[PDB]
Amino acid sequence: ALSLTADQMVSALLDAEPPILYSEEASMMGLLTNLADRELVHMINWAKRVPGFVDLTLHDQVHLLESAWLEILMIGLVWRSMEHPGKLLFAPNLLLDRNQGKEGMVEIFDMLLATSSRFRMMNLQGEEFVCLKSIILLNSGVYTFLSSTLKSLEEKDHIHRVLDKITDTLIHLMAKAGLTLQQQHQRLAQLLLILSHIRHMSNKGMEHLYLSDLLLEMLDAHR
Amino acid sequence: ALSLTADQMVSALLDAEPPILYSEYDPTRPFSMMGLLTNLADRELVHMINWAKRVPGFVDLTLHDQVHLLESAWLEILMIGLVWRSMEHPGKLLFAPNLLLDRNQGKMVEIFDMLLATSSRFRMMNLQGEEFVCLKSIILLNSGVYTFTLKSLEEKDHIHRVLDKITDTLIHLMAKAGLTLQQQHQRLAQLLLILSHIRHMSNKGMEHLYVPLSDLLLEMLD
Ligand SMILES: CN(C)CCOc1ccc([C@H]2C[C@]3(C)[C@@H](O)CC[C@H]3[C@@H]3CCc4cc(O)ccc4[C@H]32)cc1
Numbered sequence: 001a002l003s004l005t006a007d008q009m010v011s012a013l014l015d016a017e018p019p020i021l022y023s024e025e026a027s028m029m030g031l032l033t034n035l036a037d038r039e040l041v042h043m044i045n046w047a048k049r050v051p052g053f054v055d056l057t058l059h060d061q062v063h064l065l066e067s068a069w070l071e072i073l074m075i076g077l078v079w080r081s082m083e084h085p086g087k088l089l090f091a092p093n094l095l096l097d098r099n100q101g102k103e104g105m106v107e108i109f110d111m112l113l114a115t116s117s118r119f120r121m122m123n124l125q126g127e128e129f130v131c132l133k134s135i136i137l138l139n140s141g142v143y144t145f146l147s148s149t150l151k152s153l154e155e156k157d158h159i160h161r162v163l164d165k166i167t168d169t170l171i172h173l174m175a176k177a178g179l180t181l182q183q184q185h186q187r188l189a190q191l192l193l194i195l196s197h198i199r200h201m202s203n204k205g206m207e208h209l210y211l212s213d214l215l216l217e218m219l220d221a222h223r
Numbered sequence: 224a225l226s227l228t229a230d231q232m233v234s235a236l237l238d239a240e241p242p243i244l245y246s247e248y249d250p251t252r253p254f255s256m257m258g259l260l261t262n263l264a265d266r267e268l269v270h271m272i273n274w275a276k277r278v279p280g281f282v283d284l285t286l287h288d289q290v291h292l293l294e295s296a297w298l299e300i301l302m303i304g305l306v307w308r309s310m311e312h313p314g315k316l317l318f319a320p321n322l323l324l325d326r327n328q329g330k331m332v333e334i335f336d337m338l339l340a341t342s343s344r345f346r347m348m349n350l351q352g353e354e355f356v357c358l359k360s361i362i363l364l365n366s367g368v369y370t371f372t373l374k375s376l377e378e379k380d381h382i383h384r385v386l387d388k389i390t391d392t393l394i395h396l397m398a399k400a401g402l403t404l405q406q407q408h409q410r411l412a413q414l415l416l417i418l419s420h421i422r423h424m425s426n427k428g429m430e431h432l433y434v435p436l437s438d439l440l441l442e443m444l445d
Pocket residue numbers: 032033035036037039040070073074076077090105108205208209211
């Protein structure tokens with residue numbers, strides 16, 4: 001993991017991407033839940049392909065996915081919706097506007113649409129997107145490992161080492177886009193600050209919903 | 224604001240720092256914790272508004288947008304302030320000089336641990352004062368910028384231009400400390416990723432926490 005070049009990192013993440021799934025007023029939440037549950041299965045397979053992730057203990061892999069899974073679903077939704085102003089592309093056959101969200105759902109819908117609009121304005125590129133999604137996976141739960149055994153300290157150090165490599169990769173991508181050193185750290189900062197708003201929307205979504213055994217079952221594979 | 228140098232931005236942010244307040248209880252009397260902490264936070268919020276008015280670029284926004292940004296960020300800002308002054312007190316939170324609490328007195332339990340871990344992370348990274356004041360201003364300008372008309376796009380543009388100015392300043396400070404370019408952007412990323420965790424704690428705090436606040440903020444701004 002830590003020996004990969006930036007191009008090799010991008011290649012690995014692009015190759016890990018999960019498929020775009022298809023769906024299937026009163027049935028709308030059931031449709032969305034069924035989709036999200038099917039997407040979570042593929043998210044587990046994707047996470048095992050993010051360099052460094054399977055180097056962690058099963059317990060830590062579970063902790064990271066338990067913290068980040070809804071952020072990951074949301075950032076994937078915002079990415080799929082980016083070219084569709086005013087709409088959230090939950091699936092190619094499930095494209096919704098605000099009025100269809102009208103439960104406390106519309107507040108989240110507006111936040112998601114705003115993030116999609118921001119991605120569009122920044123002209124977010126697909127290689128940047130996969131780097132952001134991997135950052136979410138590794139970062140969101142790394143401050144809530146409630147133990148510091150020696151093993152936990154080693155795990156946290158490895159995660160931070162891999163996060164550093166993804167940053168280096170994001171900078172590399174912008175440098176190849178002909179950006180200025182100053183433009184490079186400015187864009188890096190702008191992208192990472194959007195991650196704070198994605199956390200916010202995940203918290204709100206989790207409230208609106210009101211898992212670790214399922215995660216470990218899917219993660220705890222045999223050979 | 225956009226014309227300040229990085230040294231000038233740092234100096235302005237340092238000069239704008241609010242004072243450390245004391246908890247308002249009799250030390251010559253039996254030792255109410257939630258009441259004490261709320262009273263402290265309410266007094267700190269006034270000084271927070273004064274600090275915000277001194278963050279370069281903030282008062283150039285409309286009063287409505289100033290209010291929106293403070294309403295979104297205020298608990299995050301109180302939290303990063305708390306973590307920063309607890310940094311030299313492992314396993315404790317220095318809410319005030321006369322109100323230093325550990326885990327057990329915290330029993331808030333879940334957030335208390337989150338705050339302690341943030342403090343540990345800052346301690347481990349050897350966060351400097353000049354970096355802290357940049358991160359705190361970034362929270363002010365970024366937290367509400369996604370939840371706001373041509374004036375609005377102008378306002379958002381101005382906010383991002385200032386944020387870009389503060390990113391330049393963080394980079395300048397790290398370059399000054401002798402970091403390589405690789406180490407600068409790695410450190411920049413590590414600090415900004417901690418801000419996602421402060422957002423999470425603020426959301427939990429709001430959750431646990433529960434005249435509009437916008438009206439009170441408006442009166443304090445005047
Ligand atoms: C995974 N299951 C174990 C738990 C169920 O998880 C989910 C069930 C439904 C959704 C839906 C319905 C939610 C929460 C609304 O109420 C407010 C925000 C909505 C989510 C936004 C992000 C998102 C992304 C997807 O790609 C598929 C569905 C969803 C949505 C998202 C996750």
